[PDB]
């Protein structure tokens, strides 16, 4: 720690809505003119920042999961959410938003109504009668007898390759 990512540096600095899309294990801002138009094959992270009368900022973090998003995208959205909350000193309330089941609050961020569209960025992932036990045991042993040891092994010698730490 800390995360030094450029988008973290921008996150929650002033009141407003910020949206990022998970793209190949990164958090990439969504162009503001496309806010509200969600690819159902993707996952997003949304930060709503609100000015409190006490001068502080209030934070709600929503991670939105499209029906067709890949496991790397949904997992990354969840992790980025934790990381952003921690960066914001734990003050953000976290919300999981699933396509078709979003909270009233999330839906309310989008005054023209959020819309879905198919597609998205590609995943970042790169009988025989009574049991005759003696017969079974003989078979198993025959199978075992025929097993040959691997000859290609790097042997473990307990060699230490790194530097031994000494307290000062």
């Amino acid at each position: 720690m800390v995360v030094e990512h450029p988008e973290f540096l921008k996150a929650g600095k002033e009141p407003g809505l910020q949206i990022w899309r998970v793209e190949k294990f990164d958090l990439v801002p969504v162009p503001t003119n496309l806010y509200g138009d969600f690819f159902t094959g993707d996952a997003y992270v949304i930060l709503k920042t609100v000015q409190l009368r006490n001068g502080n900022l209030q934070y709600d973090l929503h991670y939105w999961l499209g029906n067709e998003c890949s496991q790397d995208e949904s997992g990354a959205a969840a992790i980025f959410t934790v990381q952003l909350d921690d960066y914001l000193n734990g003050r953000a309330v976290q919300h999981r938003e699933v396509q078709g089941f979003e909270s009233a609050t999330f839906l309310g961020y989008f005054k023209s109504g959020l819309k879905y569209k198919k597609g998205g960025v590609a995943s970042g992932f790169g009988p025989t009668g009574p049991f005759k036990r003696e017969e079974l045991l003989d078979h198993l042993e025959k199978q075992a007898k025929e097993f040959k040891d691997r000859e290609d092994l790097v042997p473990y010698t307990g060699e230490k390759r790194g530097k031994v730490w000494v307290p000062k």
Partner: protein, 371 residues
């Protein structure tokens, strides 16, 4: 620069490359040493074997498991496993790769330190990190809040997690898992007249377990069906072509998860420990836990277990609760997949413990950086 992810369990190593969607190497977490065969050996001989080989040669080896109930207890043999994993399964030079390791819930402080120490001093990794297994599984399911049921070969945990972090005071550990279920299935098959009790036969018992066992939705009803008809029986072909028949052993075996007294353990079953864990958490977050019960690990793979858990938790919980059980098909690897995703993030680069940080601070840095 590619990071490695190693998820070390009681029974199986899952190891691979960050960014891949599955571990490239999955193999028994065992070291085997030859049994006496009538003559004293006889040196220059391979005096030890690891993983797949050890398993194949089990008939003439004594096997040791360095991890017991998810905790590393034999450090010498653990180092052997790690060495074998790097050099002989992944075929990499560890000094070239940041390495993400996993740990059990409530892993002792001294253990986390020794893992750190070994990675840097033995294997000279350039960087490393240690993550909690259940938390990785939760992340893999695309959640920051839920309660994980993680059940493997040696240990079962209930781990409640809120907004990204486990709640340690509410974690429950049960030393009952897949190996106990295999032992139990061996016992009740012996009861039926099939005595699969030697090490040579052990893999047959595990295979029957993984292929034919299931959790009954209503156990005692199921027992009555099995007594009243042959409708639940299955034939099973042994490696020598012999065919055996099994009946109520199919669902008696994993019933043990719900009724540990079947193998003489006094513990509550996994539905009760799940409930007890939730009840140790703040009332205000319980609703979120009930709605996000995530199953992880190979011993959660029994058909019917999710529905059975859904039923039992529903009976225990206030009627006002939305109960949901999440059981991904890939859940034998959900810990590993979560690690793969985490170690791949653009934001993860500064989270690693670097060699330099270690060389300056020593093993205790793990408590501050891996948290």
């Amino acid at each position: 620069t590619t990071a490695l992810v190693c998820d070390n369990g009681s029974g199986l190593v899952k190891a691979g490359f960050a960014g891949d969607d599955a571990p490239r190497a999955v193999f028994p977490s065992i070291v085997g040493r030859p049994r006496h065969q009538g003559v004293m050996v006889g040196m220059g001989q391979k005096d030890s074997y690891v993983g797949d080989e050890a398993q194949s040669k089990r008939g003439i080896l004594t096997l040791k498991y360095p991890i017991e109930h998810g905790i590393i207890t034999n450090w010498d043999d653990m180092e052997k496993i790690w060495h074998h994993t790097f050099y002989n399964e992944l075929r990499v030079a560890p000094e070239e790769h940041p390495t993400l390791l996993t740990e059990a819930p409530l892993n002792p402080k001294a253990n986390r330190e020794k893992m750190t120490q070994i990675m840097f001093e033995t294997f000279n990794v350039p960087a490393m990190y240690v993550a909690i297994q259940a938390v990785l599984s939760l992340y893999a399911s695309g959640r920051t809040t839920g309660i994980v049921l993680d059940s493997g070969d040696g240990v079962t945990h209930n781990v409640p997690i809120y907004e990204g972090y486990a709640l340690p005071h509410a974690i429950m550990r049960l030393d009952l898992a897949g190996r106990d279920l295999t032992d139990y299935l061996m016992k009740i098959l012996t009861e039926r007249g099939y005595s699969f009790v030697t090490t040579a036969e052990r893999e047959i018992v595990r295979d029957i377990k993984e292929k034919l066992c299931y959790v009954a939705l209503d156990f005692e009803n199921e027992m009555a069906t099995a007594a009243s008809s042959s409708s639940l029986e299955k034939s099973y072909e042994l490696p020598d072509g012999q065919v055996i028949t099994i009946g109520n052993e199919r669902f008696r075996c994993p019933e043990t998860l719900f009724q540990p007294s079947f193998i003489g353990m006094e513990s509550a079953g996994i539905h009760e420990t799940t409930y007890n864990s939730i009840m140790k958490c703040d009332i205000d977050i319980r609703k979120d836990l009930y709605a996000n019960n995530v199953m992880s690990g190979g011993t959660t793979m029994y058909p019917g277990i999710a529905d059975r858990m859904q039923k039992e938790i529903t009976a225990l919980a206030p009627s006002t609760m939305k109960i949901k059980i999440i059981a991904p098909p890939e859940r034998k690897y959900s810990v590993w997949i979560g690690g793969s995703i985490l170690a791949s993030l653009s934001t993860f680069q500064q989270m690693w413990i670097t060699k330099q940080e270690y060389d300056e601070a020593g093993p205790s840095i793990v408590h501050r950086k891996c948290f």
